[PDB]
Amino acid sequence: DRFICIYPAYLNNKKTIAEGRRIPISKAVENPTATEIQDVCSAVGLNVFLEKNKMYSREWNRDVQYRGRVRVQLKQEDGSLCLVQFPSRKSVMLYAAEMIPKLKT
RNA sequence: GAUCGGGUGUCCGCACUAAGUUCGGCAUCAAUAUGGUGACCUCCCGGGAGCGGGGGACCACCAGGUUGCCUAAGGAGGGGUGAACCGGCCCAGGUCGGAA
């Protein structure tokens, strides 16, 4: 249950920094959903599970494309990292916004 | 002192003026030092979230301290709208995050 939280607004380049965005607009994607975040994180070897009805507090869009929250495992509960490539949440958010466009485009 | 010279201001659909009487049109500058506000961009740092700590970049408006290669004149006036989603703020309920 000590898994970090990642919203689709963290990688949304059509959102300002005050609207939820966590990475620059140069390395962010246009409208990533919580299923594109879980699929490209689980495709590198990460422990990710999807909470499809978990919305963002700063998100206002009541429709389905903007809901969702992905919960990623960084530590095996012994303090050690699951992968040495993902030590922080920012290395999980710069990887998913790099592999999401390879899916549909 | 009789007529009466010599000359003006009353009479005009008049000539030109320009203190007022009255309603409109157009128009109404910019740079500095200080602080403030709002946004936005980009980094670190902490967190299971809503979030919290910190470094810069840029934009507009704002207060008021000096000013000008500034005006035909350019107030640091007064007000109103700020909504059907675009100012900021305080935000009931609701609502999203939370075990709270």
Swiss-Prot record:
Disulfide bonds: none annotated. Keywords: Cytoplasm, Nucleus, Ribonucleoprotein, RNA-binding, Signal recognition particle. GO terms for cellular component: nucleolus; nucleoplasm; signal recognition particle, endoplasmic reticulum targeting. Coiled coil: none annotated. GO terms for biological process: SRP-dependent cotranslational protein targeting to membrane, signal sequence recognition. It is found in: Cytoplasm; Nucleus, Nucleolus; Nucleus, Nucleoplasm. One of its GO terms (molecular function) is 7S RNA binding. Component of the signal recognition particle (SRP) complex, a ribonucleoprotein complex that mediates the cotranslational targeting of secretory and membrane proteins to the endoplasmic reticulum (ER). Binds directly to 7SL RNA. Mediates binding of SRP54 to the SRP complex. Belongs to the SRP19 family. Component of a signal recognition particle complex that consists of a 7SL RNA molecule of 300 nucleotides and six protein subunits: SRP72, SRP68, SRP54, SRP19, SRP14 and SRP9. Interacts with IPO5, IPO7, IPO8, KPNB1 and TNPO1. Interactions with IPO8 and TNPO1 may be involved in SRP19 import into the nucleus. This is Signal recognition particle 19 kDa protein. It comes from Canis lupus familiaris. The gene is SRP19.
